[model samples]
Target: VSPSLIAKFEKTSKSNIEGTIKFTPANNGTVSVSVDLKGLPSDIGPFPYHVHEKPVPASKNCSATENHFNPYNGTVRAATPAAHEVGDLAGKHGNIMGESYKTEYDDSYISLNEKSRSYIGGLSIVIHANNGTRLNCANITLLDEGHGNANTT
Candidate 1:
């Protein structure tokens, strides 16, 4: 299995937020997510994030990433997590409440296995304001291949 993947954000003219969203494969077929971020604007809160179906292209527009990852036809208002979209992380766990945020949780719907339909590799993650503004986004990249290839040039 791939060891881990991460999406890192840096301060830019388009956004002031900086953060890293790490995804690691768990032993029980779930993906463990680690969220550590700062620099969010204090005026707006309760940031909702998701694993979008498409990756950020060279243009770097967050909206180009398209909709949330939902290979199972899950909805946004499903009563249970199992019925919700696989990429509806904020809906399943919780939304960011403050300017800076930190949290960790295991997601049962998404997968790290590239062969699985729910695989999250190559997707982009979007952090959106409560008003649906995509404040920042980054593409999920591989950190290691379980082989020492991470250090290869």
Candidate 2:
């Protein structure tokens, strides 16, 4: 059995938003990606969320989590929707709704194990507005469920 990864995302960039993302095993080979985020601005929407490639510092600047998990040279990094990357959640799962939205997907591009570059542990997840502005971010730290311990980001 594969070890599951869980990370809780707090607010960042002087914004009020919070969420948790869970990457668990699927019946198929792909991993099951799930998220529940809330406290978005009223009627706020259509922002791009991604499983980034770096961890954020305690400072919490969303931009610091810059390296997105780009599987393709997706033009939708901030603009354009063509050539969507494997980790471009917005391009694949649509956008977040007004206050909250719970999203789930069976992602094959993401590697739940640490051997791959797309591994979720020690990475970050950042949310960006439609205008390509980073709204918030948090480092998706590794949770050691095997021994009920914690790992560094």
Candidate 3:
């Protein structure tokens, strides 16, 4: 598939994130997914960036955002051990300092397919304060097809 098929999230109470997610055909039945984020609040430092099990509600607080998106029935853990769940991307955390941030991941964690529980199509990207508590957030649907390249460096 083309990189244009990726989705983007404009704004959230916690921070501002925009990037492209692409799925490239790979060996076996897997595909490589990549994402890039920028323009997050600097006050929010060391935030935990991961897919959530539930979609973020416009009226709900950050705590209501739920845990990481672990549809594989896996426990919350770092993305290191081979046994870790696909949703575990703790190693791919993003930075926030009122400056710009950029992160890229090419793994089998989630996909564009709406039918898959690991699909982040309906989830939101949460930005927690330095203490790991949710503060600002933004939601993006992954069902669209588009491509964008911006200077984040």
Q: Who wins the TM-score comparison?
A: 1
Query: Which ranges of candidate 3 are over 4 A from the true structure?
Result: 1-34, 78-82, 92-98, 143-153
What candidate 2 gets wrong by more than 4 Å, as runs, is: 71-83, 148-153
Sorted by lDDT, highest first, which candidate order results? 1, 2, 3
Clashes (backbone N, CA, C under 3 Å), per candidate, total 0, 0, 9
What is candidate 2's local distance difference test score?
0.72
- lDDT by residue (tens digit), candidate 1, 21-132: 9998887778889999999977777898999989988878999999999999888876788988899999889887788899999998888888889889899999999998
Q: Residue 99: error of model 3 in Å?
A: 2.5
Computed on alpha carbons, the lDDT of every model, listed in order, comes to 0.88, 0.72, 0.53
Candidate 1 lDDT (Cα, 0 to 1): 0.88
Q: What TM-score quantifies how close candidate 3 is to the native fold?
A: 0.61
Q: Which stretches of candidate 1 lie over 4 Å from their true place?
A: 145-153
* Model 1 collision count: 0
Native-to-model Cα distance after best TM-score fit, residue 90 in candidate 2, in Å: 1.5
Candidate 2 TM-score, C-alpha based: 0.80
Please give, for residues 1-153, the per-residue lDDT of candidate 2 as tens digits.
Answer: 557776676764578788887888788778888888887766546777887767777788778777767755565535544356756767766777678878887877677777775667777778877667888877765556444245543
